[PDB]
């Protein structure tokens, strides 16, 4: 059930150079089409303005209306949905605001009740969203 | 524990194995003589013949090869295993 020979080092090698492609944890990270469809250019964060403010429901077991934002990036000009993670911190978000967006916490997947949103908002017009909540900073009006 | 000698088995267990599976292999055939019915020129003949033999002393067939052992037409003196 193996090669195991002593002049076979090439076949053990051109087999594993072939069967690595079926490890989806490796096919994604080593094929140019996986990163291309990423709205980020592989970056950690990406700035971009806010072009509306919309809410999205939750999955079947538990009901709610998660609040979100329709952020358009400036890097690629794409359009993505960004969750606004905080308690009632949709009062500081406004149209044409240039918010900073980060990965949601599952390396390119949804999390929990939120359907189809993989992005959360960390800053809002160059002030930290945590700072606005706890009050340390203040967004000038 | 089924601990039995594979070196010194009975001369009668050795016939309970194939021609090849014995201690030291040896053929199951035996070279035999035949007295050539009607004459006294005694010829050799191999027990597991695969060919007929015809006797000038008989002008009739002597051994008939059938299966994997010979059958002799008429009885004769049969020495054996002088080898």
């Amino acid at each position: 059930g193996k090669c195991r020979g002593l002049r076979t080092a090439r076949k053990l090698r051109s087999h594993r150079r072939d069967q690595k492609w079926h490890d989806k944890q490796y096919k994604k990270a080593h094929l140019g089409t996986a990163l291309k469809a990423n709205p980020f250019g592989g970056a950690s964060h990406a700035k971009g303005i806010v072009l509306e403010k919309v809410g999205v429901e939750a999955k079947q077991p538990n009901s709610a209306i998660r609040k979100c934002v329709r952020v358009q990036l400036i890097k690629n000009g794409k359009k993505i949905t960004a969750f606004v993670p905080n308690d009632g911190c949709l009062n500081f978000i406004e149209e044409n605001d240039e918010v900073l967006v980060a990965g949601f916490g599952r390396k390119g997947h949804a999390v929990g009740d939120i359907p189809g949103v993989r992005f959360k908002v960390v800053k809002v017009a160059n002030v930290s969203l945590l700072a606005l909540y706890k009050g340390k900073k203040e967004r000038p009006r | 524990p089924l601990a039995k000698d594979l070196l010194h088995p009975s001369p009668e267990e050795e016939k309970r194995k194939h021609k090849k599976k014995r201690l030291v292999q040896s053929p199951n055939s035996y070279f035999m003589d035949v007295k050539c019915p009607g004459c006294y020129k005694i010829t050799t003949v191999f027990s597991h013949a695969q060919t007929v033999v015809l006797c000038v002393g008989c002008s009739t067939v002597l051994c008939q090869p059938t299966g994997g052992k010979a059958r002799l037409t008429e009885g004769c003196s049969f020495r054996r295993k002088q080898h």
């Binding site: 195991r4 020979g5 002593l6 | 524990p1 089924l2 601990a3 039995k4 000698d5 594979l6 070196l7 201690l23 030291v24 292999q25």
Partner: protein, 129 residues
């Protein structure tokens, strides 16, 4: 067919030791196999054996003893550069305290402890413990 005629003999005794027999016969013979079993017998792992002779090959009978636990073979015949020997006897042996691995060598076939004193290496054959 038969390729590693050392491997088949060792599996023939290993399967016969597991059952609990006292004697076992192996079908082919060789200096490689005779000089092998002598290494075991020089440690007392087995009893005292006989080597039936023919014109064809020879067939060894061994008087097994209840002292060896497993008698493996390792193929392909690798190399042991005497810096890998300490790796081998730690991922292929039960412990350092006992058990030996036999590796062929420019000075005959000998278990690894012999190799250290004679300060040499060479290809590897198998192991027991």
């Amino acid at each position: 067919v038969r390729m590693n005629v050392l491997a088949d003999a060792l599996k023939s005794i290993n399967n016969a030791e597991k059952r609990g027999k006292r004697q076992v016969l192996i079908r082919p013979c060789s200096k490689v196999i005779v000089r092998f079993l002598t290494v075991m017998m020089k440690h007392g792992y087995i009893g005292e054996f006989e080597i039936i002779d023919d014109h064809r090959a020879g067939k060894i009978v061994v008087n097994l003893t209840g002292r060896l636990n497993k008698c493996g073979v390792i193929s392909p015949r690798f190399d042991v550069q005497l810096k890998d020997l300490e790796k081998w006897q730690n991922n292929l042996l039960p412990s350092r305290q006992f058990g030996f691995i036999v590796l062929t060598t420019s000075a005959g076939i000998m278990d690894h402890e012999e190799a250290r004193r004679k300060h040499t290496g060479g290809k590897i054959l198998g192991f027991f413990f």
